[PDB]
Design a protein around this ligand. Structure first.
Ligand SMILES: NS(=O)(=O)c1ccc(-c2ncc(Cl)c(Nc3cc(C4CC4)[nH]n3)n2)s1
Ligand SMILES: NS(=O)(=O)c1ccc(-c2ncc(Cl)c(Nc3cc(C4CC4)[nH]n3)n2)s1
Lengths: 255, 255
């Protein structure tokens, strides 16, 4: 519809997915640009999907940090088709790391360290509030018009942790590994493992050791190689135990 | 009423003022604690007051920065008395600089620098978005449970700028001076000027030079004295021209 609950004037699609479509809208009451995530409408008439969407809002509303995209409001739209659930979120006028890597190529080491170090902060806060991201990838890290780092989707086979690939339990270390794959990508311009099928990639994550970043892309310090390969360790006990631990090591390479 | 728009379960009063009363509530839809600012109800039945409250929401919603208390939602409550306007805001579980100065005494120089330097950032963002605070005082700067600096009231004679005291035009420099009075207070435990009447204080701000901080409270560097007295300069051209300029000088004393 045109206006959700006669207050949110919907605009251009910023992105879409399997269950929800993300629009850019204007909150008429507050006179501000907001990002509105709406359900597929056909999934809204299902108790399994509705429970997942309403709890996705509640989990995201539970985290208030500058590097995490904020939830402002939630509701339902008066369509003749049925009640339409929506989440009103902080609008981030920016581009994803995926867009940056694809269009501008790899980042300078110092800018890549600055970006991933700020992403570590968002993740460590999440872990402190007992939430594990479960989906860290370039598509979920944006860079603001103010150059600020913003992380979305709190609550793709290339950026899985070995435990995820094996279908085992996950924790903060599973997010650290996933972030290591992102840091590797923004540094070298390529993810740590690639293959013609997703199983070809899943197996590599579990058994095949990672190619050092200095070897894939020229002019990368052996200091950075050691940080990236530590986040990318196969055993979670051998990785950084917190995202704070990872930022601390990155901050050191930078200085 | 009990629940505003059958979604905001009101609780304890955090503070009150001339036009609006600030409560702590729970957004039932999102399962989160929020700060809800409600109008006096008797003022809600007036077009002059309603315009001021609805625009106060819009001005505050226009600023998205970690050191500025966020606006989440706005609305009206279904009371038999009449429509009751309310602003739903970010809950900051903390204490004001006023409470800290009154109960714990002055802050250590290094903690006072850290607090006011972070407040400068909030103000410079406001100025960049064309908003002048107009009311910087200890009561409007809180310290989070996470120790984060949070500024409220975007949109008392002791913390006026000389231009405000003279009833002249105001800008970013009027906020810099006002913040200088706050920095002076958290450092020495006293505001720069005090008198039995508000006019006694207004006159001092305009004509009487400030007593150096090192003289009022022991163990204060002449480096800090120069920063504080620069923010407290009588002519706005002689003060720091931006709040960024002030933070830069504070950051230097600290290091
Ligand atoms: N979620 S998605 O469809 O993969 C997707 C990918 C990229 C997205 C994107 N692109 C450009 C801009 Cl300017 C933007 N602004 C946003 C987006 C959000 C999201 C959290 C609600 N807040 N502010 N978002 S949306
Ligand atoms: N505005 S006032 O009445 O002077 C006033 C003075 C002190 C206040 C206070 N005290 C304790 C806490 Cl734990 C708290 N939390 C808040 C408050 C807000 C305000 C912006 C809506 N967000 N989060 N606020 S309220």
């Amino acid at each position: 519809p045109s206006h959700l609950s006669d207050r949110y004037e919907l605009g251009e699609i910023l992105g879409f997915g399997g269950m929800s479509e993300v629009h850019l809208a204007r909150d008429l009451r507050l006179h501000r640009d907001v990002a509105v995530k709406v359900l597929r409408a056909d999934l809204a008439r299902d108790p399994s999907f509705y429970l997942r969407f309403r709890r996705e809002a509640q989990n995201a509303a539970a985290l208030n940090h500058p590097a995490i995209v904020a939830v402002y409001d939630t509701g339902e739209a008066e369509t003749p088709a049925g009640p339409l659930p929506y989440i009103v979120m902080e609008y981030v006028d920016g581009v994803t790391l995926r867009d940056i890597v694809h269009t501008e190529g790899p980042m300078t080491p110092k800018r890549a360290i600055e970006v991933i170090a700020d992403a570590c902060q968002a993740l460590n806060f999440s872990h402190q509030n007992g939430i594990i991201h479960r989906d860290v990838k370039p598509a979920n890290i944006m860079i603001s018009a103010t150059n600020a780092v913003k992380v979305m989707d709190f609550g793709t086979a290339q950026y899985l942790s070995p435990e995820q690939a094996r279908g085992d339990s996950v924790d903060a270390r599973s997010d650290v590994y996933s972030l290591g794959c992102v840091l590797y990508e923004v540094l070298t311009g390529e993810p740590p493992f690639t293959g013609d099928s997703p199983v070809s990639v899943a197996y590599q994550h579990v058994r095949e050791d990672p190619i050092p970043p200095s070897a894939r892309h020229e002019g990368l310090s052996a200091d950075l190689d050691a940080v990236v390969l530590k986040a990318l360790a196969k055993n979670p006990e051998n990785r950084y135990q917190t995202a704070a631990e990872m930022r601390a090591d990155l901050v050191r390479v930078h200085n």
